[PDB]
Each structure stands twice: as C-alpha cells, then as structure tokens.
Coordinates of all heavy atoms in Angstrom, one line a residue:
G271 N 0.8 -1.2 0.0 CA 0.0 0.0 0.0 C 0.8 1.3 0.0 O 2.0 1.2 0.3
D272 N 0.2 2.4 -0.4 CA 0.9 3.7 -0.5 C 0.8 4.5 0.8 O -0.2 4.4 1.5 CB 0.5 4.4 -1.7 CG 0.9 3.8 -3.0 OD1 2.0 3.2 -3.0 OD2 0.2 4.0 -4.0
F273 N 1.8 5.4 1.0 CA 1.6 6.5 1.9 C 1.2 7.7 1.1 O 1.5 7.7 -0.1 CB 2.9 6.9 2.7 CG 3.6 5.7 3.3 CD1 4.7 5.1 2.7 CD2 3.2 5.2 4.5 CE1 5.4 4.0 3.3 CE2 3.9 4.2 5.1 CZ 5.0 3.6 4.5
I274 N 0.6 8.7 1.7 CA 0.5 10.1 1.0 C 1.3 11.0 1.9 O 0.9 11.2 3.1 CB -0.9 10.6 0.9 CG1 -1.8 9.6 0.1 CG2 -1.0 12.0 0.4 CD1 -3.3 9.9 0.2
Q275 N 2.4 11.5 1.4 CA 3.2 12.5 2.2 C 2.6 13.9 2.0 O 2.3 14.3 0.9 CB 4.7 12.5 1.8 CG 5.5 13.4 2.7 CD 6.9 13.6 2.3 OE1 7.3 13.1 1.2 NE2 7.7 14.3 3.1
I276 N 2.3 14.5 3.1 CA 1.7 15.9 3.1 C 2.7 16.9 3.7 O 2.5 18.1 3.4 CB 0.3 16.0 3.8 CG1 0.4 15.5 5.3 CG2 -0.7 15.2 3.1 CD1 -0.8 15.8 6.1
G277 N 3.7 16.5 4.4 CA 4.7 17.4 5.0 C 6.1 16.9 5.2 O 6.3 15.7 5.3
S278 N 7.0 17.8 5.3 CA 8.4 17.5 5.6 C 8.8 18.2 6.9 O 7.9 18.9 7.5 CB 9.3 18.0 4.4 OG 9.0 19.3 4.1
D279 N 10.1 18.2 7.2 CA 10.6 18.9 8.4 C 10.0 20.3 8.7 O 9.5 20.6 9.8 CB 12.1 19.1 8.4 CG 12.9 17.9 8.1 OD1 12.4 16.7 8.3 OD2 14.0 18.0 7.6
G280 N 9.9 21.0 7.6 CA 9.6 22.5 7.7 C 8.1 22.8 7.5 O 7.8 24.0 7.4
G281 N 7.3 21.8 7.4 CA 5.8 22.0 7.2 C 5.3 21.3 6.0 O 5.9 20.5 5.4
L282 N 4.0 21.7 5.6 CA 3.4 21.1 4.5 C 4.1 21.3 3.2 O 4.7 22.3 3.0 CB 1.9 21.7 4.4 CG 0.9 21.4 5.5 CD1 -0.4 22.0 5.1 CD2 0.7 19.8 5.7
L283 N 4.2 20.2 2.4 CA 4.7 20.3 1.0 C 3.7 21.1 0.2 O 2.6 21.3 0.6 CB 4.8 18.9 0.4 CG 5.6 17.8 1.1 CD1 5.5 16.5 0.4 CD2 7.1 18.2 1.2
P284 N 4.2 21.7 -0.9 CA 3.3 22.4 -1.8 C 2.2 21.5 -2.3 O 1.1 22.0 -2.5 CB 4.2 23.0 -2.9 CG 5.4 22.2 -2.8 CD 5.6 21.7 -1.4
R285 N 2.5 20.3 -2.6 CA 1.6 19.3 -3.2 C 1.8 18.0 -2.4 O 2.9 17.6 -2.2 CB 1.8 19.1 -4.7 CG 1.7 20.3 -5.5 CD 0.3 20.8 -5.8 NE 0.2 22.0 -6.6 CZ 0.2 23.2 -6.2 NH1 0.2 23.5 -4.9 NH2 0.1 24.2 -7.1
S286 N 0.7 17.3 -2.2 CA 0.8 16.0 -1.6 C 1.5 15.0 -2.6 O 1.4 15.2 -3.8 CB -0.6 15.4 -1.2 OG -1.4 15.2 -2.4
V287 N 2.1 14.0 -2.0 CA 2.9 13.1 -2.8 C 2.6 11.7 -2.5 O 2.7 11.3 -1.3 CB 4.5 13.4 -2.6 CG1 5.3 12.4 -3.5 CG2 4.8 14.8 -2.9
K288 N 2.2 10.9 -3.4 CA 1.9 9.5 -3.2 C 3.2 8.7 -3.3 O 4.0 8.8 -4.2 CB 0.9 8.9 -4.3 CG 0.4 7.5 -4.0 CD -0.7 7.2 -5.0 CE -2.1 7.8 -4.6 NZ -2.2 9.2 -5.0
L289 N 3.5 7.9 -2.2 CA 4.8 7.2 -2.1 C 4.5 5.7 -1.7 O 3.6 5.4 -0.9 CB 5.6 7.8 -1.0 CG 6.1 9.3 -1.1 CD1 6.7 9.7 0.3 CD2 7.1 9.4 -2.2
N290 N 5.4 4.8 -2.2 CA 5.3 3.4 -1.8 C 6.3 3.1 -0.7 O 6.2 2.2 0.0 CB 5.6 2.5 -3.0 CG 5.2 1.1 -2.8 OD1 4.0 0.8 -2.6 ND2 6.1 0.2 -2.8
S291 N 7.4 4.0 -0.6 CA 8.4 3.9 0.4 C 9.1 5.3 0.6 O 9.0 6.1 -0.3 CB 9.5 2.9 0.0 OG 10.2 3.3 -1.1
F292 N 9.7 5.4 1.7 CA 10.5 6.6 2.0 C 11.7 6.4 2.9 O 11.6 5.5 3.8 CB 9.7 7.8 2.4 CG 8.9 7.6 3.7 CD1 9.5 8.0 4.9 CD2 7.7 7.1 3.8 CE1 8.9 7.9 6.1 CE2 7.0 7.0 5.0 CZ 7.6 7.3 6.2
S293 N 12.8 7.1 2.7 CA 13.9 7.0 3.6 C 13.8 8.0 4.7 O 13.2 9.1 4.5 CB 15.2 7.4 2.8 OG 16.4 7.3 3.6
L294 N 14.2 7.7 5.9 CA 14.1 8.5 7.1 C 15.3 8.5 7.9 O 15.5 7.5 8.7 CB 12.8 8.1 7.9 CG 12.3 9.0 9.0 CD1 11.6 10.3 8.4 CD2 11.5 8.3 10.0
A295 N 16.2 9.5 7.8 CA 17.4 9.5 8.5 C 17.2 10.2 9.9 O 16.2 10.8 10.1 CB 18.5 10.2 7.7
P296 N 18.2 10.0 10.8 CA 18.0 10.6 12.1 C 17.5 12.1 12.0 O 18.1 12.9 11.3 CB 19.4 10.5 12.8 CG 19.9 9.2 12.2 CD 19.4 9.2 10.8
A297 N 16.5 12.4 12.8 CA 15.9 13.8 12.9 C 15.0 14.2 11.8 O 14.4 15.3 11.9 CB 17.0 14.8 13.2
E298 N 14.9 13.5 10.7 CA 14.0 13.8 9.7 C 12.5 13.5 10.2 O 12.3 12.6 11.0 CB 14.2 13.0 8.4 CG 15.5 13.4 7.7 CD 15.6 12.8 6.3 OE1 15.8 11.6 6.2 OE2 15.4 13.6 5.3
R299 N 11.6 14.3 9.6 CA 10.2 14.0 9.9 C 9.4 13.9 8.6 O 9.6 14.7 7.7 CB 9.6 15.1 10.8 CG 10.0 15.1 12.3 CD 11.2 15.9 12.5 NE 11.0 17.3 12.4 CZ 11.8 18.3 12.0 NH1 13.1 17.9 11.7 NH2 11.5 19.5 12.0
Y300 N 8.5 12.9 8.5 CA 7.6 12.8 7.5 C 6.2 12.9 8.0 O 5.8 12.2 9.0 CB 7.7 11.5 6.7 CG 8.7 11.5 5.6 CD1 10.1 11.9 5.8 CD2 8.3 11.2 4.3 CE1 11.0 11.9 4.7 CE2 9.2 11.3 3.2 CZ 10.5 11.6 3.4 OH 11.4 11.7 2.4
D301 N 5.4 13.9 7.5 CA 4.0 14.1 7.8 C 3.2 13.3 6.7 O 3.3 13.7 5.6 CB 3.6 15.5 7.9 CG 2.4 15.8 8.7 OD1 1.6 15.0 8.9 OD2 2.3 17.0 9.2
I302 N 2.6 12.3 7.1 CA 1.9 11.4 6.1 C 0.5 11.1 6.4 O 0.0 11.1 7.6 CB 2.7 10.0 5.9 CG1 2.7 9.2 7.2 CG2 4.2 10.3 5.5 CD1 3.2 7.8 7.1
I303 N -0.3 10.7 5.4 CA -1.6 10.1 5.6 C -1.5 8.7 5.1 O -0.9 8.4 4.1 CB -2.7 10.9 4.8 CG1 -2.9 12.3 5.4 CG2 -4.0 10.1 4.7 CD1 -3.8 13.2 4.5
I304 N -2.1 7.8 5.9 CA -2.3 6.4 5.5 C -3.8 6.2 5.5 O -4.5 6.5 6.5 CB -1.6 5.3 6.4 CG1 -0.1 5.6 6.4 CG2 -1.9 3.9 5.9 CD1 0.7 4.7 7.3
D305 N -4.3 5.6 4.4 CA -5.7 5.4 4.2 C -6.1 3.9 4.4 O -5.8 3.1 3.5 CB -6.2 5.9 2.8 CG -7.7 6.0 2.7 OD1 -8.4 5.5 3.6 OD2 -8.2 6.6 1.7
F306 N -6.7 3.6 5.5 CA -7.0 2.2 5.9 C -8.4 1.8 5.5 O -8.9 0.7 5.8 CB -6.9 2.0 7.4 CG -5.5 2.2 7.9 CD1 -5.2 3.3 8.7 CD2 -4.5 1.2 7.7 CE1 -3.9 3.5 9.2 CE2 -3.2 1.4 8.2 CZ -2.9 2.6 9.0
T307 N -9.1 2.7 4.8 CA -10.5 2.5 4.4 C -10.8 1.2 3.8 O -11.7 0.5 4.1 CB -11.0 3.7 3.5 OG1 -10.8 4.9 4.2 CG2 -12.5 3.6 3.3

C-alpha cells in the first residue's frame, strides 16, 4: 500500500505526494496520511 506524504521537516509540502516507500534518517520528519478505508 501507499503513503501520502503531506509534509516534511519544515511544514506542509506544496503538493501531496503518493509514495510506496521513503527514507528517514535521524531527525527527519515525514507528515503522512495512511488510508486504511
């Protein structure tokens, strides 16, 4: 299943991004939506 990324460290992205995977190094933040519907 996919994530929808809505934000990065500094706040909301300009556009939401559909992702199957993402890298997350120390101190990085991903603001994401997961749709379990």
Side-chain angles (χ1 to χ4, degrees):
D272 289 328
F273 311 101
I274 298 166
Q275 185 186 5
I276 57 170
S278 51
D279 307 337
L282 294 180
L283 300 177
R285 304 283 182 268
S286 69
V287 181
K288 188 172 280 84
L289 298 170
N290 198 64
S291 69
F292 63 91
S293 182
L294 190 77
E298 291 194 286
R299 286 90 71 210
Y300 270 59
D301 202 334
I302 64 170
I303 290 171
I304 302 178
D305 192 351
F306 298 106
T307 306

